Design a binder for this molecule. Structure first.
Ligand SMILES: NC(=O)c1ccc[n+]([C@@H]2O[C@H](COP(=O)([O-])OP(=O)(O)OC[C@H]3O[C@@H](n4cnc5c(N)ncnc54)[C@H](OP(=O)(O)O)[C@@H]3O)[C@@H](O)[C@H]2O)c1
Ligand SMILES: N[C@@H](CCC(=O)N[C@@H](CSCO)C(=O)NCC(=O)O)C(=O)O
Ligand SMILES: CC(C)(C)n1nc(-c2cccc(O)c2)c2c(N)ncnc21
Ligand SMILES: CC(C)(C)n1nc(-c2cccc(O)c2)c2c(N)ncnc21
Length: 274
């Protein structure tokens, strides 16, 4: 009955710092995952040289077969999962020349659909007193404010369903392909919209857990890790990966029986208004 925590996108950046902290603070096994097996194994070796003992499993959140193989591994080895940190994500660099509609499709595929597929496959494995942490971004809040009032209403809704949200996320991508995203009320940041998806998906999944698994004391939240020096944000950012890991780790390790936060967007360990 060994407890297990898992971090997606764990080979570098904020993900690696989360894995490192969980190795020290989580009472059980910690699984570092990475899409590239050599990069993941190198990260495990780095942490071993620091005196830590993470496990490794491959995971690419854009490959459903990869997610399913991880699901099967967790069921066989642990009988489920205690802590899930959905950290993996991508962004196009500012003024990357890639056509915007391609930036939209690609960023959405990973940040939203990939994250959603991991939740689809692994949420059923979450044990009582488990915790799920979805790494979103303050860019979701910024993007939300740049949406039309109609879209703001839909994304802030307490009654929105997962299928409605998926419809809206695909609508953004389709609108960019048709040359109509501005006209249809969307913001200019594709990354921002994908993080709207992550934030709102967390709200919905928290509602579903309270509906379907009441009594199991599972807490699920979205978070902003802050502005962190990584390959995504670059060297000018204000936080180290260590500092970036604090809020996700806080949310992952919420004491047993805690009533909240649940279904919240959390920054600097504090609940933000959506
Ligand atoms: N200031 C910030 O850095 C900041 C602020 C707010 C929110 N965030 C969010 O924080 C999370 C971590 O970002 P970071 O700054 O640490 O970026 P990063 O240094 O680029 O690390 C991203 C991690 O995600 C992994 N990843 C990307 N696509 C994947 C996929 N399809 N399957 C599995 N893993 C995948 C990457 O793997 P590869 O090494 O193989 O590319 C890497 O391990 C992201 O969700 C990001 O949006 C970051
Ligand atoms: N055109 C893209 C913009 C995405 C974007 O903003 N990328 C930032 C990090 S995501 C938070 O804004 C980035 O890569 N910054 C560092 C750099 O530009 O070198 C979209 O619309 O999604
Ligand atoms: C206090 C925690 C558990 C967060 N911590 N952090 C760190 C730590 C220190 C420097 C960098 C880092 O990534 C983590 C640490 C350590 N080296 N030894 C013992 N405990 C440590
Ligand atoms: C470029 C600025 C400084 C505006 N930036 N970028 C980010 C940023 C960088 C990479 C990813 C992300 O989600 C956000 C950021 C942040 N999280 N908090 C505060 N400021 C941020």
């Amino acid at each position: 009955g060994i407890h297990v925590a898992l971090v997606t996108g764990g080979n570098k950046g904020i993900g690696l710092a989360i894995v490192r902290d969980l190795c020290r603070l989580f009472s059980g096994d910690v699984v570092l995952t990475a899409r590239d097996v050599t990069r993941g194994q190198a990260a495990v070796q780095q942490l071993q040289a620091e005196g830590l003992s993470p496990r490794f499993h491959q995971l690419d959140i854009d490959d459903l077969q990869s997610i399913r193989a991880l699901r099967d591994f967790l069921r066989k080895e642990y009988g489920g999962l205690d802590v899930l940190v959905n950290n993996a994500g991508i962004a196009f660099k500012v003024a990357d020349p890639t056509p915007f509609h391609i930036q939209a499709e690609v960023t959405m595929k990973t940040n939203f659909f990939g994250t959603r597929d991991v939740c689809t496959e692994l949420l059923p494995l979450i044990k009582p007193q488990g915790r799920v942490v979805n790494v979103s971004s303050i860019m979701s809040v910024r993007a939300l404010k740049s949406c039309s009032p109609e879209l703001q209403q839909k994304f802030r809704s307490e009654t929105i369903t997962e299928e409605e949200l998926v419809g809206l996320m695909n609508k953004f991508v389709e609108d960019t392909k048709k040359g109509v995203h501005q006209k249809e009320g969307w913001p200019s940041s594709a990354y921002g919209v994908t993080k709207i998806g992550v934030t709102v998906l967390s709200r919905i999944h928290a509602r579903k857990l309270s509906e379907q698994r009441k009594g199991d004391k599972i807490l699920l939240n979205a978070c902003c890790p802050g502005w962190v020096r990584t390959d995504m944000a670059g060297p000018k950012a204000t936080k180290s990966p260590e500092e970036g890991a604090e809020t996700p780790v806080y949310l992952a390790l919420l004491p047993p029986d805690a009533e909240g936060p649940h279904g919240q967007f959390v920054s600097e360990k504090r609940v933000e208004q959506w």
